[PDB]
Design a protein around this ligand. Structure first.
Ligand SMILES: C[C@H](N)C(=O)NS(=O)(=O)OC[C@H]1O[C@@H](n2cnc3c(N)ncnc32)[C@H](O)[C@@H]1O
Length: 441
């Protein structure tokens, strides 16, 4: 079967052969978008094109975009290690139409690449599609133009409990380009738990969302109102890791060639032997987001972007500790990561030594309190009455040991213990008041 690198290239070759300009992945960090924490989709760097504020020499494009979803509008951090399909860092394979072609041709391109004997040749019978409930045009295209049996075309309304809050209406953020969308799912088989989209068991890893095709129609405002874009456009994105899993005949993203090699490296540096332990997958995921974010200019800190990075590094280090890592290990995964990323890791390779030292320094800094903080948390859990750790203890771990609340929550979750987030926030606010009182005017 094709390697991850070959799949990435074949996707780009396909759209290039269809007249799409190949554009390089943008950085994970925008210089000119105050509303965006980290790049979360291929469309981010073309936001102004969709808005009609910018025009390129090309009206159609294709990219393999590095994305991080660990904060802001799209945040999958807490899913990592718990599903076969979620990462913090991942590549989104995309094609874009800037007032060029629209619904029918976007759907046809996607179906062709996926199912043609000349291309990916996926078994058509295992593919399901969803459309926005009110998108009658998309429904008809799938039914009559493509020929998907009706039983595998699923209409999804505003299933997130609010107007335009839906799995089939995609939004870049609270503001920005958005529109109804249609998604293609692959059924991995009845040996995996889960049901199709719209079913009670839809959240399972059996029927996995491979490719989202967005019909960009509006610019959402802060009020929540939808202002139409000047030209209806197309924004698509397919998870490289998810399609690689399908193509390599495995069910989990973590079983693709890229992650198999990376997870082996994690076991090596931590001393772990059980290759099935979820901490190996969490760490393999976390090195990708951490190393690339640093390569793209983020430095660990206690505010904004730097704090998300710090949070992820420390959580990864914590997982390494649980695996029994005896010495500083996280920075040792940069080399192995570069070796599996191909041309998609060129920016990281260019800055290898710098990224390594940043990660080494951060882990060493955290090691000053990690073991001691874990010992305290263990003591507090051993005498804990109930299923919820008190907010005062969470705050103490934060204030004294530099444990982000979500890191503490991660440890507790592994023991079926919750954290009183409200109590933690009340303790934070109490400290803020003390600071205001002492500092004065
Ligand atoms: C096209 C659009 N702007 C968009 O971002 N749609 S989407 O949110 O659904 O993402 C495109 C895709 O990337 C993949 N994807 C999304 N979040 C992911 C994550 N946290 N980890 C791995 N893959 C993810 C999915 O295959 C998915 O259909």
């Amino acid at each position: 079967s094709k390697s991850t690198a070959e799949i990435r290239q074949a996707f780009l070759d396909f759209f290039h052969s269809k007249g799409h300009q190949v554009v390089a992945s943008s950085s994970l960090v925008p210089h000119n978008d105050p509303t965006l924490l980290f790049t979360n989709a291929g469309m981010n760097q073309f936001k102004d094109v969709f808005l009609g504020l910018d025009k390129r020499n090309y009206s159609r494009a294709t990219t393999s975009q590095r994305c991080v979803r660990a904060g802001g509008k799209h945040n999958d951090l807490e899913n990592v290690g718990y599903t076969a399909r979620h990462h913090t860092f991942f590549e989104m394979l995309g094609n874009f139409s800037f007032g060029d072609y629209f619904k029918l041709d976007a759907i046809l391109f996607a179906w062709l690449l996926l199912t043609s004997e000349k291309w990916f040749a996926l078994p058509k019978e295992r593919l399901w599609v969803t459309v926005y409930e009110s998108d009658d045009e998309a429904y008809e295209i799938w039914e009559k133009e493509v020929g998907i049996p009706r039983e595998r075309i699923i209409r999804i309304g505003d299933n997130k409990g609010a107007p335009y809050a839906s799995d089939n209406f995609w939004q870049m953020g609270d503001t920005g380009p958005c529109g109804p969308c249609t998604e293609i799912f692959y059924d991995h088989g009845d040996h995996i738990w889960g049901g199709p989209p719209g079913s009670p068991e839809e959240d399972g890893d059996r029927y996995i969302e491979i490719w989202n095709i967005v019909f960009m129609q509006f610019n959402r405002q802060a009020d929540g109102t939808m202002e139409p874009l000047p030209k209806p456009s197309v924004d698509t994105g397919m998870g490289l890791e998810r399609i690689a899993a399908v193509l390599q005949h495995v069910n989990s993203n973590y079983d693709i060639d890229l992650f198999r090699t990376l997870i082996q490296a994690v076991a090596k540096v931590t001393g772990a032997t059980d290759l099935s332990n979820k901490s190996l997958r969490v760490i393999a995921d976390h090195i990708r987001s951490c190393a690339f974010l640093i390569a793209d200019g983020v430095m660990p800190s206690n505010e904004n972007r730097g704090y998300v990075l710090r949070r992820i590094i420390r959580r990864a280090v914590r997982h390494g500790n649980m695996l029994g890592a005896k010495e500083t290990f996280f920075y040792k995964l940069v080399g192995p990561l570069i070796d599996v990323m191909g041309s998609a890791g060129e920016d990281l390779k260019r800055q290898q030594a710098q990224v390594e030292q940043v990660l080494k320094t951060e882990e060493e800094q955290f090691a000053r309190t990690l073991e001691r903080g874990l010992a305290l948390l263990d003591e507090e859990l051993a005498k804990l009455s109930g299923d919820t750790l008190d907010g005062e203890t969470a705050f103490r771990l934060y204030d004294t040991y530099g444990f982000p609340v979500d890191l503490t929550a991660d440890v507790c979750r592994e023991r079926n213990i919750k954290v009183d987030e409200a109590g933690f926030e009340a303790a934070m606010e109490e400290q803020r008041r003390r600071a205001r009182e002492a500092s004065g005017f």
